[PDB]
Amino acid sequence: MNPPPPETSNPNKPKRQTNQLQYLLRVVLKTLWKHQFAWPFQQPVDAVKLNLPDYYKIIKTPMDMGTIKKRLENNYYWNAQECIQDFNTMFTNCYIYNKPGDDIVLMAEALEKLFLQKINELPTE
Ligand SMILES: CCc1c(C(=O)Nc2ccc(F)c(S(=O)(=O)N3CCOCC3)c2)[nH]c(C)c1C(C)=O
Numbered sequence: 001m002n003p004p005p006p007e008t009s010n011p012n013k014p015k016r017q018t019n020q021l022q023y024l025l026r027v028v029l030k031t032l033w034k035h036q037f038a039w040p041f042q043q044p045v046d047a048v049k050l051n052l053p054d055y056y057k058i059i060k061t062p063m064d065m066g067t068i069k070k071r072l073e074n075n076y077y078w079n080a081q082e083c084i085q086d087f088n089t090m091f092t093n094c095y096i097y098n099k100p101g102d103d104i105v106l107m108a109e110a111l112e113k114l115f116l117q118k119i120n121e122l123p124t125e
Contacts, residue, residue: 037107
């Protein structure tokens with residue numbers, strides 16, 4: 001079966017607004033979210049629905065842009081690097097589970113390239 005999705009809230013964890021976090025939501029995440037190849041990454045992998053019973057045997061640190069979006073929207077991240085790390089985990093997972101030439105790998109590559117292009121313009125903190 002599926003695990004519960006990653007937490008999108010931490011109670012009593014303090015909260016802040018920063019230019020970097022705003023940029024991560026309204027520029028980086030927004031741009032990736034709207035890309036033609038975003039759809040496979042907009043929610044947790046549903047291994048039951050997609051019939052991938054080994055997925056969560058292999059991937060022990062799941063991440064997706066749906067989770068990242070909700071973390072940003074709920075001020076779950078204090079440091080920009082926490083968010084950048086989540087993006088990195090998402091892409092890495094795709095290369096762990098899938099093979100060269102797979103459609104999902106081509107899509108992750110395109111999204112990762114776009115991610116790098118937008119993170120290049122991240123404001124200073
Ligand atoms: C290859 C499986 C996979 C996906 C993926 O999502 N495949 C997918 C297949 C069929 C679909 F229909 C949709 S869907 O986006 O349209 N969809 C999801 C929400 O419910 C409605 C339908 C998505 N994503 C990742 C990271 C991986 C792997 C194994 O790495």
